[PDB]
Amino acid sequence: MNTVPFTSAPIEVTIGIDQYSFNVKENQPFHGIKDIPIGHVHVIHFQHADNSSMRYGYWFDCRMGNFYIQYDPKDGLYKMMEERDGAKFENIVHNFKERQMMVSYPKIDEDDTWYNLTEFVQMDKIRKIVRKDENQFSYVDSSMTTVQENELSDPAHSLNYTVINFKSREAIRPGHEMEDFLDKSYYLNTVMLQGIFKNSSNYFGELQFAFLNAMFFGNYGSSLQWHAMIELICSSATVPKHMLDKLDEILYYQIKTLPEQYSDILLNERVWNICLYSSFQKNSLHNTEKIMENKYPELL
Amino acid sequence: GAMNSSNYAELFNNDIKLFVDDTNVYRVTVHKTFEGNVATKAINGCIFTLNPKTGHLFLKIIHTSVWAGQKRLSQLAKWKTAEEVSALVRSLPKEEQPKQIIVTRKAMLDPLEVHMLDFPNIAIRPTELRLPFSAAMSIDKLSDVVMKATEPQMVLFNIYDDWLDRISSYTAFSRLTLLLRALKTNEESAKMILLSDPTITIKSYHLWPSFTDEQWITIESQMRDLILTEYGRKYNV
Numbered sequence: 382m383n384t385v386p387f388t389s390a391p392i393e394v395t396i397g398i399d400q401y402s403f404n405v406k407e408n409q410p411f412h413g414i415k416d417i418p419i420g421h422v423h424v425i426h427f428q429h430a431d432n433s434s435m436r437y438g439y440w441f442d443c444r445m446g447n448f449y450i451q452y453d454p455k456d457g458l459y460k461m462m463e464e465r466d467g468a469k470f471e472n473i474v475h476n477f478k479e480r481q482m483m484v485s486y487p488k489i490d491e492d493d494t495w496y497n498l499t500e501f502v503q504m505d506k507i508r509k510i511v512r513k514d515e516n517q518f519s520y521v522d523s524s525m526t527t528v529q530e531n532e533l534s535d536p537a538h539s540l541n542y543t544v545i546n547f548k549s550r551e552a553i554r555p556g557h558e559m560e561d562f563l564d565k566s567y568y569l570n571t572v573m574l575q576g577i578f579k580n581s582s583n584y585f586g587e588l589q590f591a592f593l594n595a596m597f598f599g600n601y602g603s604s605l606q607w608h609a610m611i612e613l614i615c616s617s618a619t620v621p622k623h624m625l626d627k628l629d630e631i632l633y634y635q636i637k638t639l640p641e642q643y644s645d646i647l648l649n650e651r652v653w654n655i656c657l658y659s660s661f662q663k664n665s666l667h668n669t670e671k672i673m674e675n676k677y678p679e680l681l
Numbered sequence: 682g683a684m685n686s687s688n689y690a691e692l693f694n695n696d697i698k699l700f701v702d703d704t705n706v707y708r709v710t711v712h713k714t715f716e717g718n719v720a721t722k723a724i725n726g727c728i729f730t731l732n733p734k735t736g737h738l739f740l741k742i743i744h745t746s747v748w749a750g751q752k753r754l755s756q757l758a759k760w761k762t763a764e765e766v767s768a769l770v771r772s773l774p775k776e777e778q779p780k781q782i783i784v785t786r787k788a789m790l791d792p793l794e795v796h797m798l799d800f801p802n803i804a805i806r807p808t809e810l811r812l813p814f815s816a817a818m819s820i821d822k823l824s825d826v827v828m829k830a831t832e833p834q835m836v837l838f839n840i841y842d843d844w845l846d847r848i849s850s851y852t853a854f855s856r857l858t859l860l861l862r863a864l865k866t867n868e869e870s871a872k873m874i875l876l877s878d879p880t881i882t883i884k885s886y887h888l889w890p891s892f893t894d895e896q897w898i899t900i901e902s903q904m905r906d907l908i909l910t911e912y913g914r915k916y917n918v
């Protein structure tokens with residue numbers, strides 16, 4: 382188990398750790414989060430009580446360093462930092478646990494939810510999407526745009542997701558215009574899987590990361606990316622059977638976790654109706670179709 | 682974006698543009714089989730690609746052999762149209778290529794956009810105008826060349842004959858759509874109007890009769906009456 386200590390909590394804030402969240406009052410004696418599962422990436426995220434504008438947060442992997450949070454009164458946010466002095470850090474964490482000033486990561490033992498949402502997500506791949514190489518953790522917020530959004534503005538503060546565009550020369554082979562537009566298997570299998578992602582694990586990792594950024598920060602470009610990566614699979618007639626079965630599991634857990642009250646803004650009616658009821662894979666997503674029809678029958 | 686009556690005057694400026702109509706590309710007769718089922722038989726069709734400023738008509742004849750052994754022909758027909766328009770643009774010198782292509786039916790947007798990805802500066806646009814180009818096969822000389830074709834073939838016409846010597850393209854287009862709409866509403870009557878008078882003939886190198894300016898005003902009125910007549914017969918007005 383690992384720990385992310387807080388120097389202090391000077392402003393009232395709602396704090397998220399993965400799919401969990403809790404309220405901290407202004408100047409409350411809060412000094413961090415303990416018992417964080419080793420072996421998974423994690424995200425610690427923030428929404429200030431006085432300005433719900435800008436949800437923001439940090440993706441990190443506790444195996445890559447000792448990280449803590451400290452409020453910066455000049456830039457007005459909780460910042461993640463790395464402590465390179467291992468002995469200083471162990472000393473601090475021990476003092477704060479002895480005084481019980483930390484919340485415990487509240488993982489139920491039956492519960493595989495976080496694993497199921499992050500199965501293919503790797504910190505090394507996050508850091509290529511979110512470029513800030515002097516840190517081992519990655520900052521994301523509600524307003525950050527994607528490289529594709531910037532083509533249609535600061536490049537340093539962008540989400541470099543893989544660009545997917547169904548009406549692009551990359552997606553369409555000369556002489557197969559109709560075939561490649563109506564059946565995207567070429568674009569999925571040769572261009573994207575073999576060419577850019579190298580394997581389906583990296584493709585699913587980006588898909589999962591895009592969803593989580595959409596859900597936790599309301600990041601619109603991330604929601605567009607998540608849907609594009611679903612649509613490209615559903616709109617392909619030829620997809621490896623193991624990818625379809627894994628996609629069904631991935632989407633199932635994503636739909637299961639989504640706040641019921643955010644479904645209106647996080648789910649694209651066109652893509653889902655197309656994917657479940659019109660596409661080549663309309664009969665291949667049994668678990669996802671069942672949870673969608675029982676939970677969000679309005680959208681369909 | 683889309684063309685409509687708040688901005689149709691852009692058709693007559695000096696930016697090269699083409700209308701593309703696909704309503705006569707895939708044509709069939711429906712009939713009963715010996716077993717009493719129904720089947721279709723394709724007949725030759727055409728793509729109607731028209732420069733509204735000059736009157737130049739690029740008539741690509743679609744021979745029934747192009748459908749042999751293909752499935753979902755109504756969908757293929759839109760992509761075949763887009764392929765042939767794309768091939769036409771690529772065949773034209775750069776200074777003759779259109780800056781905009783206007784499709785008369787919105788289902789042509791994606792097929793044509795995909796085939797023209799190599800030409801990102803050519804705008805592909807829909808239109809709210811209800812243009813009567815489906816009636817092109819009511820022009821006898823166009824119908825004749827389509828039905829006589831034994832292989833794919835492109836034929837060039839000027840759909841305005843020599844009218845631009847005497848009138849503007851805005852007026853020539855007005856006359857053209859009024860004639861095509863009348864042919865679409867009551868082909869028999871429209872053709873009787875155009876040809877009832879044996880002293881006015883169609884020149885070998887023209888599509889329409891050699892009407893004087895005054896005769897065109899009469900013809901135009903008669904076409905206006907026909908379109909109003911049929912409207913009353915239809916709606917009992």
Ligand SMILES: CS(=O)(=O)Nc1ccc2c(c1)OCCO2
Nearest residue numbers: 689810811812813851854855858
């Ligand atoms: C195509 S239509 O049947 O609606 N008639 C139509 C359309 C555009 C025109 C026009 C007539 O007169 C010249 C100006 O532009």
